[PDB]
T-cell receptor
Framework: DSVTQTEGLVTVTEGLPVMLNCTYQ???????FFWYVQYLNEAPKLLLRSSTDNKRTEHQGFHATLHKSSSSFHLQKSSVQLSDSALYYCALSPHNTGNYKYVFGAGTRLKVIAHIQNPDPAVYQLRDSKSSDKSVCLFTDFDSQTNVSQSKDSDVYITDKCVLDMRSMDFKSNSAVAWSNKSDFACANAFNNSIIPEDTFFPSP | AVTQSPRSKVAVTGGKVTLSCHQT?????MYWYRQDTGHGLRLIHYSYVADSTEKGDIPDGYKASRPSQENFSLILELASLSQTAVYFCASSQTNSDYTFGSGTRLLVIEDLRNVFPPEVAVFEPSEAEISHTQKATLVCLATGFYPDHVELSWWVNGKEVHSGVCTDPQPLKEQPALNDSRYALSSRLRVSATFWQNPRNHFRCQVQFYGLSENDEWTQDRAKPVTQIVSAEAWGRA
């Protein structure tokens, strides 16, 4: 009848554990419990299911144990990865009642952040390939504990940080982009609104 | 096993809309949910019976028809602005767990006049990053599009790449003040300096836009802003 999940966004750094709470309220005794994962733009896909109290279920390093006594079905993982960033739905389904239908919780979005071993913050300027007058400022190589914030100017656009992985080099990096048309737009002036590190490299050139 | 159609729709306030679901796997149950941030997945209509329907938690503003065992369809007579959400179709065997479709992004707007495809541009990596870290980041920018129905991809030397790529999860409003503001999306492709230095290497930024359909009326001067692809190219420099 009622499924209650953790509210909002859960931010965890790669390698660390996670706990996504799910509590319910059901009149029924023979009930099936589920976790569905939804990766960006894809269909929700089953991850775990169980109908038996106190039994633990494991799948992709994701465990969940039914606790009927406290109406709990939490989702856990000991060492989270970047591919784990998704929306997770907790669901309930009473067996043997005629009309089969799920009871979903609102969902919990998990965002996983990179562990940057060797940072070196920098703000470079990139130029357009066709007709080279347009420009973009690239803020890159900062640690995950650095948070980018949007500009106080309505002519300036700043995107949030985003990690990229070069599989060949086993190397990962955080990047954020800034662009504006106005003549009053400098790369040194682009990320003032954000808590940028003291050692942020700014080329002259 | 479960297919949704259309994959995307831009409809008008008042217009007739029809979303179709076709199950290739035989199941007695079929449902239509809408996904909303905060609300999650909510049921609109379901069918236990191969040739009739039953009302879910929010049937208001909707009609649904199951004329086959394999086909469940969603119908809106007066498309309201409220009806814009991602729609999900699921089929299940009663004992069985659901199988889901990929979903349809439906957008009900006032004026199809607000619809615009994106402008894509590739920005060459900085010599400063090329010296300092021996790596080269290419930026792609897709600007001035409405709605935010875009898929961005990178193509190195004719093949799709995923490694050393990162795209914004959600686009960003160009004029956050306005209700029907256009969007912008960025992407980054990071290569080794060698790879960019080589003038014989070709980089392409592909943007699939979802807009108007063939049947949509366009009584405007500019080109009809239909579903389309928009690209921007780059070759290395030494």
């Amino acid at each position: 009848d009622s499924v209650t999940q953790t509210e909002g966004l859960v931010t965890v750094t790669e390698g660390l554990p996670v706990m996504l709470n799910c509590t319910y309220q059901t009149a029924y005794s023979d009930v099936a419990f589920f976790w569905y994962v939804q990766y960006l733009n894809e269909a929700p896909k089953l991850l775990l299911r169980s109908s038996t109290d106190n039994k633990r279920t494991e799948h992709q390093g994701f465990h969940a144990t039914l606790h009927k006594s406290s109406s709990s079905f939490h989702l856990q993982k000991s060492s989270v990865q970047l591919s784990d960033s998704a929306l997770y739905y907790c669901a309930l389904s009473p067996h043997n009642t005629g009309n089969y239908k799920y009871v979903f919780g609102a969902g919990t979005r998990l965002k996983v952040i990179a562990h940057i071993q060797n940072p070196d913050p920098a703000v470079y300027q990139l130029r357009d390939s066709k007709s080279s007058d347009k420009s973009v400022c690239l803020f890159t190589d900062f640690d995950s504990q650095t948070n980018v914030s949007q500009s106080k100017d309505s002519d300036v656009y700043i995107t949030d940080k985003c990690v990229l992985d070069m599989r060949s080099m086993d190397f990962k990096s955080n990047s954020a982009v800034a662009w504006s048309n106005k003549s009053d737009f400098a790369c040194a002036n682009a990320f003032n609104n954000s808590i940028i590190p003291e050692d942020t490299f700014f080329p002259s050139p | 096993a479960v297919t949704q159609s259309p994959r995307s729709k831009v409809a008008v306030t008042g217009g007739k809309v029809t979303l179709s679901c076709h199950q290739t796997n035989n199941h007695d149950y079929m449902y239509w949910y809408r996904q909303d941030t905060g609300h999650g997945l909510r049921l609109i209509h379901y069918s236990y019976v191969a040739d009739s329907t039953e009302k879910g938690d929010i049937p208001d503003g909707y009609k649904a028809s199951r004329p086959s065992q394999e086909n469940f369809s969603l119908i809106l007579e007066l498309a309201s602005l409220s009806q814009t959400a991602v729609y999900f179709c699921a089929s299940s065997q009663t004992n069985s767990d659901y199988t889901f479709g990929s979903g349809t992004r439906l957008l009900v707007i006032e004026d199809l006049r607000n619809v615009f495809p994106p402008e894509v541009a590739v920005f060459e990596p900085s010599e400063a990053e090329i010296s300092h870290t021996q790596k080269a980041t290419l930026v792609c920018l897709a600007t001035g599009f409405y709605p935010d129905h875009v898929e961005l991809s990178w193509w190195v030397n004719g093949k799709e790449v995923h490694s050393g790529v990162c795209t914004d999860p959600q686009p960003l409003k160009e004029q956050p003040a306005l209700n029907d503001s256009r969007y912008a999306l960025s992407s980054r492709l990071r290569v080794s300096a060698t790879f960019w230095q080589n003038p014989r290497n070709h980089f392409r930024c592909q943007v699939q836009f979802y807009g108007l359909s063939e049947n949509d009326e366009w009584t405007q001067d500019r080109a009809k802003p239909v579903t389309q692809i928009v690209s921007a190219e780059a070759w290395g420099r030494a």
